[PDB]
């Protein structure tokens, strides 16, 4: 019983894990690169 429970816990944990981090990485990349390309267009204007 320990075996089936522990390993089910590992599975659920890893799924939540990689989901959480791909969320945060995508949001952060979008924001920082968003304003970065904005600064690119602004400096490129002059």
């Amino acid at each position: 019983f320990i075996r089936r429970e522990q390993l089910r816990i590992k599975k659920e944990k890893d799924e939540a894990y990689e989901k959480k981090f791909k969320r945060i990485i995508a949001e952060i990349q979008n924001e920082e690169g968003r304003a970065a390309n904005e600064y690119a267009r602004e400096k490129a204007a002059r």
Partner: protein, 102 residues
């Protein structure tokens, strides 16, 4: 005999499966059980719910067949193993409880 044939016969003895009867026939039946008998039917005819010795008794004593239920044992053992071991694993290191004398 076959499982198929014996079960068809039995459910015909109950009358659940037979030919299409008539209106006056249903009148006669209303003129003149089934649930617990069908419980026994499904019990008898899904017999790989459980385990049985094929011999019978080694000695026949008279003084006045299911010797077990594997699925029920796995079920109840699952319930007990959950209600103890899982909550131990979840409160591995939990300090503090309520002590109640009454």
């Amino acid at each position: 005999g076959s499982q198929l044939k014996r079960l068809k016969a039995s459910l015909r003895e109950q009358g659940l499966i037979g030919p299409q009867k008539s209106k006056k026939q249903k009148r006669q039946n209303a003129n003149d059980q089934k649930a617990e008998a069908l419980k026994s039917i499904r019990e008898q005819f899904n017999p790989f719910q459980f385990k049985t010795n094929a011999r019978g008794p080694k000695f026949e004593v008279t003084t006045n067949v299911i010797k077990g239920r594997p699925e029920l044992s796995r079920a109840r053992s699952e319930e007990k193993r959950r209600q103890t071991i899982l909550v131990e694993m979840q409160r591995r290191n939990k300090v503090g409880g309520i002590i109640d004398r009454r």
